Every structure is written in C-alpha cells, then in structure tokens.
Structure 1
Amino acid sequence: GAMNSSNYAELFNNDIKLFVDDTNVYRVTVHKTFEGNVATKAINGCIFTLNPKTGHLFLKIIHTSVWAGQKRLSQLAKWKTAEEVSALVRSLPKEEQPKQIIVTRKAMLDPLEVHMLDFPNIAIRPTELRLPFSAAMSIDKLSDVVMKATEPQMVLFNIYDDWLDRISSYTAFSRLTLLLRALKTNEESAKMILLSDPTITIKSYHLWPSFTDEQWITIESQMRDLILTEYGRKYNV
C-alpha cells in the first residue's frame, strides 16, 4: 500500500520502481491586469519521474502550449501527468518497465491508475514521506532546460551524477533528499553552501559539484545545519 519509514529500504531493492512528482507540472505567475483584476500566466513545467536505485530521471517538460484553451488546469495537470507517465512506461522495453510507481501526492493515484489499467501488474502507490522533489527546479541545469523548451520534450538525467561509483543508492538518495530539502527550506543559503568555493566545479555532464568524499561530509553537515537552522528561525527555537 503506502510507502513510509518502515519500508524505506524497499526503494533500493532490485524491483524496478519510479517515483512520480507532479508539483511542477502546472506552474503560473499571478499578476494584475490593466483593469486591476488578477490573472495567471503559465510557465513551462516538468514531470519529475525518478528511479531511486539508478538515479535515472525522466524529466518530461510540459510546454505552456498544452494548456492553451483548456479549463480546470490544476485538474488537467494531474491527468496530463498520468498520461505522460503511461506513455513513458509503454515506450520502455518490458524488462525495463517498473513494477511499482510511487506518487508523491495522493491526488495522482486515481489519474495514474486509470491511465495504467492496461498494466494491472504495475502497483500504483502513495507515500507518507514528505519528499522534497518540488525543489527539483532549484537545480540550475534542470530549471534551464525547462525554461528554454519551446515544445514538449523528454530529457534524461542521472540525478546522482557519478555518486554510485562510490556510495550505495541508499546513501545517494539520502544525499539527494538532503540537498533538495535544503534547497526547499532556504534556496539561497543552500546554493551558497554548494557553490561558495570556486575551485569545486560542476562537470559539464553533471548536475552537482565534483566534491570529494571528505567535501561531501562537510557539505552534508552544512545542509543539516541549514535545515535545523531555518527550523529555528521559523519556530523561534
């Protein structure tokens, strides 16, 4: 059924699974109109679909043109998410199709289940984890490809860069969620932490900087601090 702390190691077994986060699919800026009314303007979005074991990220970019002339866009966005995830699964060879899809928001369950009626062996699951995947657009290179897109487009990334050469997927996911939590709680501090030192670069083919093992521990500690911090500043503790 639902996914929580009791079964956190299931993510890193050998059953193919994908997380799907739809929080950045329908994005808007809200503004005043000349008549003093309020209007929205949509901007490009993305479906964040991620294999937590391999780090493979199927970033489906949602171009604003898909909303043209449509009604109830927050609701359409969920079904559009489901449609595009269903399309991805169908494009993958059978031995690459997930055995489970885990949705980060419960409102995605019915839209995805309906789109995947053709795949009755694929389990559609919620989670009780509060995962920070909405902060994916704080990753500069992901944000860049979404905002530059002029048409619908799937871009493939490895959100772990080369980390799996040195650490396990359990540790790689925990780093990723720590980084994304930090970016979500205080993006500027998080980004300052990551890029303060000019001598640690981000390789062209990577998303994150080329930290050594020792540097990652310092970074990880600095991001923990940030998250405990902002939690004070928030709750005055």
Structure 2
Amino acid sequence: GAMNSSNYAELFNNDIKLFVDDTNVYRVTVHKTFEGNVATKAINGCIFTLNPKTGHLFLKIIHTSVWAGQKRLSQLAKWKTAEEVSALVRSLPKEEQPKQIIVTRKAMLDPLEVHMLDFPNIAIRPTELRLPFSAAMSIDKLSDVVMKATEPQMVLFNIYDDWLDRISSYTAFSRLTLLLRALKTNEESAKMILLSDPTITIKSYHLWPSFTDEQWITIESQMRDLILTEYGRKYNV
C-alpha cells in the first residue's frame, strides 16, 4: 500500500520505481489589478519525476501556454501531470518501465491511475513521508531551465551528480532530502551554506558543489543545525 519509514529501504532494491511530485506543476504570482482586484499570472512550472535508485530526474517542464483558455487549473494540473507521466512511461523501453510509481500527494492517485489503465501491472502508491521535493526549484540550474523554457520540454538530470561513485543510493537519497529539507525551511541560509567557500565549485554537468567526503560531512552537519535552528526560531525552543 502506502510508503513510510518502515518500508523505507524498498526504494533502494532493484525493482524500478519513480517518485512523482506535482507541487511545482502549476505556479502563479498573485498581484493586484488596476481596479484594485486580485488576479494571478502563471509562470512556467515543472513535473519532478525521480528514480531514487539511480538519481535519474525526468524534469518535464510545463510552459504557461498549457493553461491558456483553461478553467480549474489546479485540478487540470493534476491531470496534466498524470498525462505526462503516462506519456513518459510509454516512451520507455519495457525493461525501463517502472514497476511502481509513488506520488508525493494523494490527490494525484486517481489522475495517474486513470491515465495508467493500460499498465495494470504498474503499482500506483501514495506515501506518508513529508518529502521536500517542492524545494527542487531552489536548485539554481533547475530553476533556470524551467524559467527560460519557451515550449514544453523534457530535460534529463542526475540529481545525485557523481555521488553514486562513492556512496550508496540509500545514503545519496538521505543527502538529497537533507539538502532539500534545508532549502525548504530557509532557502537563504541553506544556500549560503552550500556556496560560502568560492574554492568549491559546481562542475558544469552537476547540480551541487564538488565536495570531498570530509567536506560533505561538514555540509550535512551544518544543514542539520539549520533545520533544528529554523525549528526553534519557528517553535521558540
């Protein structure tokens, strides 16, 4: 059924699975109109489809043109996500198709399930975790390709850079969620922490800095402190 801390390690076995997060699919800025009323303006968005075992991130970018003349966009967004994930799966060779798709939000289950009727053997599951994938647009190179897109466009990343050369998928997933959780709770500090020392660079083909094993421990610790801190500043403890 659903996914939680008890069946946490299943993510890193050898059945192919993807997480889908639709948080950043429909994005708006809210502003006032000349008549003093409120209106929204949509900005480009994206579907966040991730293989937690490999790091492969299927970033499907959602251009604002997809909303033109549409009503009830928050509901459409969930169905648009489901269409794109289904289209993604269909485009994959059978041996690359996932055996499970875990949605980060329960509202996506019916839309995806209905779009996936042709794949009765692919399990669509929710999860009880509070995964921080919505902070993916706090990742500069992701935010950039999304905002610059002029048309629908799929872009492939490895969200773990070359980490799997030195660590396991389990540890790689733990680092990513720690980073993203930090970015979600205090973007400014989260980023100050990652980029203070201009002598650690981000290779052109990576998303994150090229930290050494020891430097990553220090990073990971400082991100923990930030999350606790922000939890105090927030809860006064």
TM-score by length of 1: 1.00
How far is the alpha carbon of 1:115 from its aligned partner? 0.0
The CA distance in 1 between the partners of 2:84 and 2:211, in whole Å, is: 35
Q: CA deviation at 1:87?
A: 0.1
Which structure 1 residue ranges, 5 or more long, are not aligned?
A: none
> 1:40 offset after TM fit, Å?
0.2
- Deviation digits for residues 2-43 of structure 1 (CA, Å, limit 9, x no counterpart): 000000000000000000000000000000000000000000
Runs of 4+ in 1 over 2 A off after TM superposition: none
**Aligned counterparts of 1:36 and 1:2: Cα–Cα separation in 2:** 45
- Per-residue CA deviations over 1:85-112 (Å, capped at 9, x if unaligned) read 0000000000000000000000000000
| SS of structure 2 residue aligned to 1:214 | helix
- Superposed CA RMSD in Å reads 0.2
SS at match of 1:54: coil
CA distance in 2, matches of 1:15, 1:207: 26
Q: CA deviation at 1:176?
A: 0.1
Distance 1:3 1:197 in 2: 38
Give 1:146 shift: 0.0
Q: Distance in 1 between matches of 2:132 and 2:228?
A: 16
Q: How far has the Cα of 1:55 moved from its partner?
A: 0.1
Q: Deviations over 1:57-76 (max 9, x none)?
A: 00000000000000000000
Any idea what the Cα deviations from partners look like across 1:189-230, whole Å, max 9, x if unmatched? 000000000000000000000000000000000000000000
Does the alignment pair 1:196 with 2:226?
Answer: no
Q: Percent identity?
A: 100
Residues 79-94 of structure 1: matches in 2 within 5 Å?
79-94=79-94
CA distance in 2, matches of 1:149, 1:121: 34
Q: What SS class does the counterpart of residue 120 from structure 1 fall into?
A: coil
State the distance in 2 between where 1:208 and 1:134 align. Answer: 17
| Deviations, residues 155-202 of structure 1 (Å, cap 9, x unaligned) | 000000000000000000000000000000000000000000000000
Q: Deviations over 1:94-152 (max 9, x none)?
A: 00000000000000000000000000000000000000000000000000000000000
**Residue in structure 1 matched with residue 216 of structure 2 by the alignment:** 216
* 2:23 counterpart residue number: 23
TM-score of the aligned structures, taking structure 2 as reference length: 1.00
Partners of 1:184 and 1:58 lie apart in 2 by 21
Give the number of equivalent residue pairs: 237
Q: Distance in 1 between matches of 2:202 and 2:47?
A: 24
Partner in structure 2 of residue 186 of structure 1 = 186
Question: 1:54: Cα distance to partner?
Answer: 0.1
Give the Cα separation in 2 of the matches to 1:225 and 1:84: 38
In structure 2, the partner of 1:228 is: 228
Q: What is the rounded CA distance, in whole Å, between the counterparts of 2:44 and 2:4 in structure 1?
A: 31
